[PDB]
Structure 1
Amino acid sequence: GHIKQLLKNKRFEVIKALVESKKIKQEWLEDLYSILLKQDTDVEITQAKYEIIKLLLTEKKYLNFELLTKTLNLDQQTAIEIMRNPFKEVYFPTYNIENPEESRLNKALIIPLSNQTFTLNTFVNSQDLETIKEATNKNFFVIFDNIFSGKSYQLAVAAGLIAKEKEILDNVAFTGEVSSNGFIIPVNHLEEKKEITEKAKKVLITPEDIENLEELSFWLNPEHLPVIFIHINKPELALQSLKQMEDAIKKDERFKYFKLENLKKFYRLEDQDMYLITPSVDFSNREELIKILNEFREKVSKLLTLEGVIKDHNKVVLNISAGISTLALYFGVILGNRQASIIYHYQKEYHKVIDLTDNPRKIKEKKSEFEKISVNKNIQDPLMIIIYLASHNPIEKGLELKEKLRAKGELIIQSKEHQGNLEIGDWSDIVSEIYTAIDDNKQKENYMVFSAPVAIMLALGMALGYFLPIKVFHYNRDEYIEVPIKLNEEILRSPF
């Protein structure tokens, strides 16, 4: 045989390149499988083993059950799982203090198994693989594309077994040892390993980022992946408010393992992907408001879909807050109430006020008797809608504007008892009652002014949608100015 001749001359590098090319005859398979049993005495044999295994799994016409059983001595159950279970490739860097040029970002191919843990590399300690099996409760097969020392690959291998999809592992690497119960053990040469991983255009995850396998599974096998979007008015409060959002997120039991830096590292997110700064907004400028709304749509789209890593849109949880009540109303109209999101109200810190993860349309459910708001109405066309939930009373100027616009109707919504000091809590009942009064009394043409918390207007935007003919008037410090964007325009259609 051709490979038999190459094997007799120990030309493993020629065999590797011949395997990297997809030009292999079936008669060469018996000698190819036998190379997997050789001792890893030099890196050329180990790298030849890796390419052989990678070819059998990517080109399954070379994946033979008879050769798996007679050559590798695998039982029929392990041989099937090697044939049918998908493999995961995870990166991990190694630094040789004795030979700095021998350092490299290595790869590990992992296949989950049922009742057997083994490797094809002779330099690997079997007890170190048993520790991974005990920590993850998963048997596995692993092979490496390089010869190295130490146990710094254990976190990477555990990542390949816990992660459900490969995309989360395509742009990240790991380093660290794993204990028998899942706790991450520190390793050496973190700074050197980081320069190796970044030189390969990847991000390194060290024990300084992940402490146990439960925290690791929060990112690699997430149940509710929390992301952040905050709108603010001052740039100097950007980074500080991102950490305050992370603080309020960590208060939730479902997101106790959330870390801002880990979200940025695992999903290739930067600080600006999670905020929108508008220092001075001219609410009379239609085009200027359009850029802000477009930038909102682009950032939210990037957060809900990420870089294609997330496949189930229900897993993303958008922790959102805004800084301008008029701007938040339009943000909510575009956001809609089909995406799982949590709205936070900021006073001193971020306060969770509306949780749409269990019932997203709870801010839209009408009630027969109003418990949180008081309604004083005279329904005629056109209708002037006034919302009074904050400290400043807009009724006087709202009714002045009603007669300036020749509006014949009025719908005055204000807090039932107490005013400007809404108790911090589930604000979804207030929003549902405000939506009820608006939806039950809406006319052919409507105008709306509001003095309410920004989180209230944000939620109200999601409840209303873009179907209602409402003209919004923004209070420019002392006078109402018409927003040149009607609340039913086609540019406000929710794409989510």
Structure 2
Amino acid sequence: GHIKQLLKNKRFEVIKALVESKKIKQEWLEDLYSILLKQDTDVEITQAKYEIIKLLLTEKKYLNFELLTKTLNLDQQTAIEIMRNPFKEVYFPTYNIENPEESRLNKALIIPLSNQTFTLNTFVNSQDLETIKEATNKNFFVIFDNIFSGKSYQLAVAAGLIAKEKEILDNVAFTGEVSSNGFIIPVNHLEEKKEITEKAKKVLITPEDIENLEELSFWLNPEHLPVIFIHINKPELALQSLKQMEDAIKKDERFKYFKLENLKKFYRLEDQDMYLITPSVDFSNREELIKILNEFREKVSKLLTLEGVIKDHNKVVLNISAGISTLALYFGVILGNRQASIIYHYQKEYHKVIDLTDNPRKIKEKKSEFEKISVNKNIQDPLMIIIYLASHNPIEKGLELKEKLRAKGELIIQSKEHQGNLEIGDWSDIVSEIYTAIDDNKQKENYMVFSAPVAIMLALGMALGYFLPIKVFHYNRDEYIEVPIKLNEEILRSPF
């Protein structure tokens, strides 16, 4: 046969070329399987082995149990697990000054097993794999696509064993050793490895980025991966504000492993993807507001998709803050009440004030008894909604606008026995009560003004949706200007 002839002549590049072209006779398979047992004397043999295994795993018409058990001397359970369990490919760089063949971004194919850990490569030390098995509490079969020295692959193999989804392993490479109790150990030649990985258009994770396997698992399989979105009015305070938000995230027990650089590396994000700058906003300009809201939409959708790495949108928590209450209202209206998030309030510390991680749809629910707000209602067809929850009192200008714009009705809402200005605290109940008052007194056409913090307005927008025909007025300095965007326009429909 051709395979016996080529193997006799040690034509491993031609054998690998035949395997990659998937043009393989069944009668050849046995010989191919025997190649898996040859000594890894040069890179041709190892690459041929790797491609043979990948062909057996991708075109399972060549995967044969009789050859797996008889030719590879595998027990029945391990062979069947190789047949059934899916494989993962992870990337790891190696730099050898003496040999350029060993300086490369190599791949490791990993199949989880139950009670055996082995490899088909002869140059790999068994105890190095047993360390990974002990650290991850998972037995595994592993094969490599290049000959190399060292154990810098331990982090990549642990990542392949821990990660539930294989998408994040396509853009991220790993280097470093692993201890028995799950400690990541530093490795040499970080700069050349980073150069190699970025040359291959991938991001590299070094032992200085993550401390242990638990931190790695937080990034690989997150239950609530935290992303950041902060709207600011001061551009030169962008990065600083981001750092503050990072610190604000670290104060949460659920996100103690969070690091901005680790998020940017793992999910291929830049700083600009997490904030929005409005130098001078005109709330009477429809086109400028349209552009700002479309930018907000694009950035939030990118943060929730992350280039397809994230499958479940509810498994991502958007830590969101703003700098303008009027703009925060539309931000909340667009964001909706289905995405898990955390609304913060900036008082020089970015304090968490509203938490919608577990159950996002619980703002739309109303209250039968008002406990934190006081309402002065007069239900008529044109309702004038006034919200007083800040230091400045907008009630006078609110009533002046009420009779100035020929608004008959009146609905004033303010805090209960807190003397106007509100203190830091849990603000979900306040927003829920305001939404209750607004929805229970909804009319055909209504106008709304407010002097309130950004978080309250953002959560109120998330609660309202785009179902209410409300006209918003922005208060710059002693005067109100109509925002030319109604809160019920089709452009504000929440896609999340």
Fold shared, TM-score > 0.5 on shorter chain: yes
Cα distance in 1 between the residues matched to 2:304 and 2:196: 31
Show structure 1 runs of 4+ deviating over 4 A.
none
Cα distance in 2 between the residues matched to 1:175 and 1:420: 56
How far is 1:100 from its partner?
Answer: 4.7
Cα distance in 2 between the residues matched to 1:359 and 1:129: 42
Asked if structure 2 preserves the Cα contact closer than 8 Å seen for 1:176 and 1:186, the reply is yes
How far is 1:240 from its partner?
Answer: 1.0
Asked if structure 2 preserves the Cα contact closer than 8 Å seen for 1:390 and 1:419, the reply is no
Asked if structure 1 preserves the Cα contact closer than 8 Å seen for 2:475 and 2:481, the reply is yes
Do the aligned partners of residues 393 and 242 (structure 1) sit closer, same or farther apart at CA in structure 2, a change above 3 Å counting?
A: same
How far is 1:423 from its partner?
Answer: 2.6
Cα distance in 2 between the residues matched to 1:211 and 1:358: 28
State the match for 2:131 in structure 1.
Answer: 131
Cα distance in 1 between the residues matched to 2:154 and 2:137: 14
How far is 1:363 from its partner?
Answer: 2.8
Cα distance in 2 between the residues matched to 1:280 and 1:489: 24
How far is 1:99 from its partner?
Answer: 3.0
TM norm structure 2? 0.98
How far is 1:238 from its partner?
Answer: 1.1
Cα distance in 1 between the residues matched to 2:222 and 2:481: 45
State the match for 2:331 in structure 1.
Answer: 331
Asked if structure 2 preserves the Cα contact closer than 8 Å seen for 1:362 and 1:428, the reply is no
Cα distance in 2 between the residues matched to 1:157 and 1:227: 26
Post-superposition CA distance 1:242-275 (Å, at most 9, x none): 1111111111111111111111111111111111
**3-state secondary structure, aligned to 1:458:** helix
How far is 1:38 from its partner?
Answer: 0.4
How far is 1:44 from its partner?
Answer: 1.0
Listed as ranges, the gaps of 5+ residues in structure 2 are none
Cα distance in 2 between the residues matched to 1:199 and 1:360: 41
Post-superposition CA distance 1:260-308 (Å, at most 9, x none): 1111111111111111111210000001100001111111111112211
How far is 1:370 from its partner?
Answer: 1.5
Asked if structure 2 preserves the Cα contact closer than 8 Å seen for 1:244 and 1:350, the reply is yes
Cα distance in 2 between the residues matched to 1:277 and 1:379: 40
Post-superposition CA distance 1:147-191 (Å, at most 9, x none): 101110000000110011111000110000000011000000001
Post-superposition CA distance 1:48-92 (Å, at most 9, x none): 111111111111111111100101111111111111111111010
Cα distance in 2 between the residues matched to 1:57 and 1:45: 18
How far is 1:310 from its partner?
Answer: 1.1
Cα distance in 2 between the residues matched to 1:372 and 1:22: 70
How far is 1:97 from its partner?
Answer: 2.5
Which segment drifts farther, 246-255 or 33-42? 246-255
TM norm structure 1? 0.98
**3-state secondary structure, aligned to 2:344:** strand
Cα distance in 2 between the residues matched to 1:440 and 1:44: 75
Cα distance in 1 between the residues matched to 2:341 and 2:469: 26
Asked if structure 1 preserves the Cα contact closer than 8 Å seen for 2:102 and 2:147, the reply is no
How far is 1:326 from its partner?
Answer: 0.2
State the match for 2:286 in structure 1.
Answer: 286
Which segment drifts farther, 235-244 or 154-163? 235-244
Do the aligned partners of residues 41 and 100 (structure 1) sit closer, same or farther apart at CA in structure 2, a change above 3 Å counting?
A: closer
Cα distance in 2 between the residues matched to 1:18 and 1:281: 63
Asked if structure 2 preserves the Cα contact closer than 8 Å seen for 1:381 and 1:409, the reply is yes
How far is 1:369 from its partner?
Answer: 2.3
Listed as ranges, the gaps of 5+ residues in structure 1 are none
**3-state secondary structure, aligned to 1:364:** coil
Cα distance in 2 between the residues matched to 1:137 and 1:332: 44
Asked if structure 2 preserves the Cα contact closer than 8 Å seen for 1:132 and 1:154, the reply is yes
How far is 1:365 from its partner?
Answer: 2.6
State the match for 1:39 in structure 2.
Answer: 39
Cα distance in 2 between the residues matched to 1:317 and 1:168: 18
Cα distance in 1 between the residues matched to 2:88 and 2:362: 41
**3-state secondary structure, aligned to 1:468:** coil
Asked if structure 2 preserves the Cα contact closer than 8 Å seen for 1:391 and 1:419, the reply is no
State the match for 1:96 in structure 2.
Answer: 96
Asked if structure 1 preserves the Cα contact closer than 8 Å seen for 2:397 and 2:478, the reply is no
After superposition, residues 404-419 of structure 1 pair within 5 angstroms as: 404-419=404-419
Asked if structure 1 preserves the Cα contact closer than 8 Å seen for 2:135 and 2:178, the reply is yes
Overall identity of the aligned pairs, in %: 100
Do the aligned partners of residues 445 and 158 (structure 1) sit closer, same or farther apart at CA in structure 2, a change above 3 Å counting?
A: same
Aligned-residue CA RMSD (Å): 1.0
Asked if structure 1 preserves the Cα contact closer than 8 Å seen for 2:414 and 2:420, the reply is no
State the match for 2:396 in structure 1.
Answer: 396
Post-superposition CA distance 1:396-435 (Å, at most 9, x none): 0010000111111000001112245423221001101111
Q: How many pairs align? A: 496
State the match for 2:239 in structure 1.
Answer: 239
